[model samples]
Target chain A: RRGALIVLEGVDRAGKSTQSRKLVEALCAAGHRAELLRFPERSTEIGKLLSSYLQKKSDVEDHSVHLLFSANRWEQVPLIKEKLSQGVTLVVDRYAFSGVAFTGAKENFSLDWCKQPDVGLPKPDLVLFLQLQLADAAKRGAFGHERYENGAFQERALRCFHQLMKDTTLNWKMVDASKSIEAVHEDIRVLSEDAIATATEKPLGELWK
Target chain B: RRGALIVLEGVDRAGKSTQSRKLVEALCAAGHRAELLRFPERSTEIGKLLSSYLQKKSDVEDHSVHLLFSANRWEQVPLIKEKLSQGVTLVVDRYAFSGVAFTGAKENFSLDWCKQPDVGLPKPDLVLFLQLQLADAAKRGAFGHERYENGAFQERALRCFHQLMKDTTLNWKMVDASKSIEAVHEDIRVLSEDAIATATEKPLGELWK
Candidate 1:
């Protein structure tokens, strides 16, 4: 009764947006309901607060920031649940994966603590990890102007992201993001098609269950 | 190096503010540095958001609302830590105990999940649970006009609160709240005096360790 809730995650400059876009387009062209989304949507009320903190417009405690990131995801749960229930396959660029990775990478924030707020969220049928080395990712371009774009922080965040995927029962796909965007998209496209079919036949999995 | 962080917790309309305030006053009058504070202090930025939501001016998911409450507490950590380091006894009218209790009592919100956002917070040296039946509490007066002030919800919240205190290593004391306001305040005052003395001799406990 629902479409696949697919999430793509990795370090910065990993081409998640580009590849996620391609996968969504390819899915729709093949006559299946599909769309794309990214985390910290930055427009909703909770997300606006996240945006201000990320952009250095506000001074907030790290703990509070972590909670805000979690709040942002919770705010989106209803919309995401509704769309997936309507058979609209969602290829999300990032979600709690990034939220936990980035925040857990910080000082004093434990990995378990970081993932709690997102507990019981809609599980992604296929979580695509855009596997890329941090050094190469930095070479792709300088990190963006956001707060979490530091080189050392990015390394730790990537490590945490790997831990998250490894520690969970999530059906995650490790994509060779070092490949060209189209190649990664093709890999993701095949994964999504099979995932959509399998997901249609099986009950959607609960995340972190 | 830090003063006692004392919290008074119970269902709303249980005279927490009245008793907590009186305890602080008595402590201060006896040459102790003590002050009363409350959760979602409703003055800071995050508190403002929580106020709007609680006052029915905003819509947030239960999970998000829970985190916001945690964030509100987190936003005060620095101030609380600084003041306590200066040996100022903090008689918090409410704290994470209420945050977890009220939210966890809601549907789909487990007590553990409600507390994760508050993990690693400054633990209270003394948690005074104002024991009162919901029926008795309502008879004191009609429940205040707020989001969580419902008869049924208050019952669940009180149950969840008992669970929180029982499930924790928190040094808690259950005070019968059916007494007169002054009687309740006297009990709190004695507890605070002993708590401040013992807390001075021991290190602060990390909440939810």
Candidate 2:
């Protein structure tokens, strides 16, 4: 009776944002209610801090940046619950998985330390990790656009992402972003169908906190 | 370093309210900064629902009550993060643990079922379970002051408290309330000290969206 929390995560330019929208559209067309929630929600006070941190206009010390990212999620949590309670599927652009993989890959912070602040957030029923190689990221035009967008940074993030997949407890499906767009969407559509079915039953288990 | 979140939990009339206050007081007296946060925090729109439910003056459905508990926690979470960042230790009078334990324990809702909505709230660093037997609860002098304050409901709650302890990922310490005031205070002081030490070493983790 609950809605699925679907998180689309991958390196920048892996097309998560674009695809997440299409998925929402497809779900709604099928008569299921759905919505998108992008992290670094950018409108809140904390998001302002995140925006400044990303733009390099204002600097939040490394550790402080991590907390700011976590706070951004905390601010939107009730809506997640409310929407799902009303049977609205939440199509999240990024959730804790990105925070773990992105920050965990950073220097001087171990993966566990990176994971510390995000311990109790909700886990996605389906975490569709868009699998892409570093070379693929370049072709996809991800580099030079934002921080953590370079090959060296993405290489570490890829490793961290894999570790997160291995250690994480939620159900996940890996979509190869290297595939053709038509093929990727096909895979996502099938995955979404399965997620929709799962939501009608009770949750598999409590995700995250 | 992230501060630890300690949640004081028990059925109504088991002395959780008094013990939580005493624990926070002792921590402050020892020179560690501490604050008490109670959930169903009556200040927000969502909390208005919980207040009405607790007073038995509102006809909120069961599922609605569960969501109210989750929403109440969501509203106060950011402020909690700010306080923790300032090195103030939070001794929450009730929190997600109570939401999980109380609603989950309610009949018509299995403990696991009641726990789903709260999957992503802030997880406590330590959960202090204050145990009082039913006979002792009746002797507390105000047992029937609230709807769920009777011995029967609390007896069921005690069983769920055990299950909550088993399900929790946080550090847990069970206290026997039959002990003398000095004995209970000494036990709480010792655990509170250790909890503060642990919370201080790790940077705080964030709740989910």
Candidate 3:
């Protein structure tokens, strides 16, 4: 049986990190072989560059970083595919949606331009979007350290994410991240279980088909 | 008065470099402010990365280097726009056409994937594709140093180039490079003069649609 790829997406401090982990724990608790992952994985060589750029330690042009983000994902495609083939469900923190939204927030970088690099990468079985208002998300701690965590940029990225949701045909289920962590975790677990069961019966689809 | 963007595109050892220079000289002789340029300019920051990849000084992945090539050209978009606006005719040696044709020759890199990153960059007014037989091109000197300078890859790239010509609406004129360099230069000069004259009257276009 193949495994589902469940992607969590949203603006900063949307509790995606918290909820993704809990969802993975819930899946494992439910007797499914599940794993957790995050983008700009911040572990590999490409991710190291992305980390430097994100921390403002290094400066890369908008398009260059966008491609780097896409490259980061490409490096993981084989592992991603292999894990799913071996029936280990992946609960990813962020994916191409975040890549396009964050990078397309920059001026002159079109949504289409941002989407080009990530086209044909592995598609998520279900994209659990943690939706929270910009004002609400801004109230969280540790929001200003990285480059894209500022309020104005988050506003831009928020709008881009919404637009991506409206435009994409992916299985995106909106979650109210402003709710209690336990509630959000419960909602994610139920949806993820359904998605994981369904995905086991179908072939994995590519991103932006 | 806007100046023409005349691009010389073809497989390696196809006389693009020699003829591009001659064409610039011819344009200048005919009283145009023509200048020569090459892709993977190998001078700017992005070009440095591309050069390292081409020279095998670094081992960047296929998709990473492909996007870098596009970024290499993109970082020059502003300068390219400024030059044409300032009435400087750009006799460009190579552009996105080669970027797509060459990289798309790879196994997993589809031509559509290769063409995506370059969607809306400035389009050339005239593309002089130097057509030549693979066997003929292979006989030229220094054919095996760079990464994409092999016979098998060139064969695949050549097919991709022909497909591009068939699909594109750009002003692509195939010149027989099997002829003497002087003969190729003469053919390019005549077509270039006509293109340069027309481009002065028309606004610049973007790549693809």
Candidate 4:
């Protein structure tokens, strides 16, 4: 069977990060070849600049920072496609969805324009959006405060994400994240299995198609 | 006056690199705030990877490496525009024209597909094509042997670059590099001056329009 590109995305405190790790573990335990990656990859060259930009230590104009974010993803496209071609399923914490939502939420931005840099990326077999409400997310002890993590911006990002999911062509699914770890993982596991099955038979597709 | 983006493109040993440096110096000496930059920028994050990829130390797929080449340029967009916005004329050694040409010459490539990553980039005010024949370029003492620097590949890249300048909207001028240093520099300096004058009156445009 071919590897499936599984992506998870949501606002701060969405257990997406926590679950992404767990999902990778379960896939491995089940004898499936799997790996995990996080967007704005801190280990890479473009990633370092992005980290500096987000930390507020460095400044980038809206359009420029937006392009850099996607550039980081594009840099990894080779390894990403290679692993999948080698039959390793990749569990990504975040990918292009957040690329669009966070940048597109900026007042001077356009959603369509933000989608250009990542236009022809390898399409994910399934995008499991770990949906979590702002109220529920804020209750977490993290109180995550960073770029685009505020209460107001979270609302805008959420709205933008919803609009992105409005297109039924992509296999974006809602995960009822308001559940126990086991329960949520159970739901995502089943979806991953379904996607993995068809992904092998169907040739890998391109993103934002 | 606003800054003008100046680019130079040619096969290896064409003296484009030599002339690009001299061109920047002349612009600065003439009281124009100028800076020199080269694509596949070795200083930046993505640039280092491209260096590795080109060096044969690291392996990346064709499409992935192509995107990374453009990503290096994208990562520098902020600084490029910032300098330009501050009225600094940028004498770019090579830019998207080379990006498209080198990759488009690959066996499994299409020029149109190669142009996507760099779409919407800040268009150069003048692309000074250092037009040099293969026979003339080969005469140089530097028998530079590196990636995409062979006789056959250089010929292919030259043809690809010629095709890119077919668009009438872009101000791609041919500089006769088959001349003495003073003569070649004089030709490029005049072109730079004209570009700086006209660019101030025209708003910056997006690339691959």
Candidate 5:
């Protein structure tokens, strides 16, 4: 039996962070070891540069920034595996899908290019892609701040998200984030609990297809 | 003209970091717009978790932690490419090769397996593999609190690095680090300048063969 790697992916403001937290807590409550992980870890030196891009302290092209975000996740592979080996569950907020969707939206690089750098990344056993209407997401306060934080970009991101699902190995589970907060939480909870239990019964597998 | 991506790879205490810094400075001194980048940036939230693992504050499995390191690099791709487009010479202390070399050396996973997740990473135009005699590296006081910093691990990493050189996309240039600081710096300085200059005439290519 291997550990579980569960990822929650979606366009920004889709409530992935909140759901990730809830899932972690729920797993803990159920006597399972669960941890939440996010991309652009922002604590490592590479992360600081990524943070700079997000905070607009630095300027970078879309394609390059996208790859870096994916690499940031790559650098922590060993540590992630260690926790999993100890029977822990890793709940990732973004994983490689965000890299693909975001970069694919960029003009010069297509979805294929964006997905390239993440060829062998740690794929999630269950990817809870929080689905939300663009209009509804913008209505959530704290919608726009950094560069790719707009309705148009979100719309494009959603398109890419669908493409990513079509091209990857992750088990996609869509949760409508437009619903009431509690409703979204319950939806994620049911799916996550089932996935965790099943994953705990199997060995850990490679990320990308 | 595509930009050049230079990677510096070696075990810790082998003076790879020092050589990497010198190489970046030399490139800048030679009038090339070069910048230095390191992995496990340890600045982002994910990085913070990696830092804990490196610092022994927590324990992680080899495979999971290794993937995190790889993911860390994935996030930095977009920025690296952007810098290259701006004609900035990018100097990475470690990249996918390190991901392949170190993790593959772990024995828990094979080199080919470790190389899987990093297939589409931004390949380096040239890899400056700072080679050091294992005996001499030990004498250099290279032990850190981080995992895979010991003699046994270094020995295994050496083999992994050797095989990675076969990756024709990453033009390999090996330098003996078992020399006076000034000597090693001078060698790296000369090699780095030539590589950067030559790269200016060659278009950037894919990472793997």
Candidate 6:
């Protein structure tokens, strides 16, 4: 049986990275060949470019930078597909949702435009959106030194993220990230197990198809 | 008076560069301020990456490369508008059409996906598609040089070019590129002059608006 493609999405400091790791661990414990993947990989060449743009080491036009972020994901398409087909579940930290949310948060950029480059990429069987209140998320820790890591921009991106939740027909479960880490983990684990089982019976779908 | 935004489109060996240059020279001779622009601009940082992808110096995924091509044009948007507002006619060789046509020619890439990043970019006032038989174009040039310069790819791109003409609501005129250079130039020259004359009367439109 093929494996499920599950994604964790959230604003900065919403515990996405931490949750993605635990989810992968949980899947592995359940006898699934699970792996953890992150976007803006920051290791490969395109990721390096995205890292530079994020860190403000270089100035790229907004549209150009957005495409770079999308490219980072496209570079993983083959591996992503191959793993899934081999019955390996992918617990991904961020994906097209963040690409669209962050880019569309910027002035004069349309969400439609942000979603275009990602149309045919692998669609997630479930997207666990760790929803956190703006103030609550900000209180978790200091914002990073990257672009779009501040309070104001996070607010803008939050609005777009919610808008995406409304607009998308994908399976999105809003997990309150304000909960304790163990609690959030429990919620995600249950949802992921159900999704993992179902994915075996369903075919992989395309994003925004 | 605002200047016209003119785009020249054709497969390789269809004389887009030669025709674009001649049109610019003709516009200047007629007392209009004119300049030549080309896509995959190949100079800026993003353009450099695009150039690498085109020349096979680097590997980039199809969707990523497609978005980069669109970003290449978007980076020029403000300057393109500035030139038109300053009454300097811009004769652009290979605009968004080439971005969509060439990339969509690849397996699994769609024309609609290729057009997303370029949605709000400044629309061309006139697009002169230099039409030629693939056989005719093949005889005029070597088969392989840069990526997308091969016959099979060009044949696929040619179909997309025609599809773009039908799908878009822009002012597209077909020119027989197989004719004598002077003949093709004449056809482009008269159409450009009329387009330039009317540009000031109409507001510039956005692509796929």
Point to the candidate with the largest lDDT: 6
Candidate 5 ranges with C-alpha deviation above 4 Å: A1-100, A107-147, A167-209, B1-96, B107-147, B175-197, B204-206
Give candidate 4's error at residue A118 in angstroms. Answer: 3.0
lDDT of 5 by residue, B159-206 (tens): 888888876656888888889988988987777777777877866766
Which lDDT value does model 6 have at A118?
86
The C-alpha stretches of model 4 lying farther than 4 A from their native spots are A27-35, A45-88, A107-109, B27-35, B52-68, B71-88, B107-113
A80-134 per-residue lDDT for model 3 (tens digits): 9999999999999999999999988889888987998998888999998888876
TM-score of each: 0.95, 0.52, 0.87, 0.84, 0.59, 0.93
Worst 10 residues of 2 chain B by lDDT: B59-68
Q: In candidate 1, which residue ranges exceed 4 Å CA deviation?
A: none
Q: How is the predicted docking of candidate 3 categorized under the CAPRI scheme?
A: acceptable
Q: For model 5, how does the per-residue alpha-carbon lDDT over A1-209 read when each residue is reduced to its tens digit? A: 55688888876788888888988898899888888888869896557868888888887645446656766776678778888888888988888888777777767666665665556666577888888776787688766578788667777877888977784556888888998878898898888778877987667777664
lDDT of each: 0.85, 0.73, 0.86, 0.82, 0.76, 0.88
Give per-residue CA lDDT, model 6, range B1-209, as digits (tens). Answer: 89999999987789999999999998899889999999979998778888888789998877777877887787788789899999999999999999888888888777777777788888899999998887787677577668887777888998999899896579999999998899999999999999999999999998897
Docking quality (DockQ) for each candidate: 0.89, 0.04, 0.42, 0.23, 0.08, 0.66
Query: What is the DockQ (computed on Cα atoms) for candidate 4?
Result: 0.23
Which order, best to worst by TM-score?
A: 1, 6, 3, 4, 5, 2
Task: Indicate the worst ten consecutive residues by lDDT in candidate 3 chain A.
Answer: A134-143
For candidate 3, the lDDT comes to 0.86
Q: After superposition, how far is residue B2 of candidate 4 from its true place, in Å?
A: 2.4
TM-score head-to-head 2 vs 4, winner? 4
**Each candidate's chain A: what TM-score?**
0.95, 0.93, 0.96, 0.96, 0.93, 0.97
The 10-residue segment with the lowest total lDDT in model 3 chain B = B137-146
B34 in model 4: Cα distance from truth in Å?
Answer: 4.3
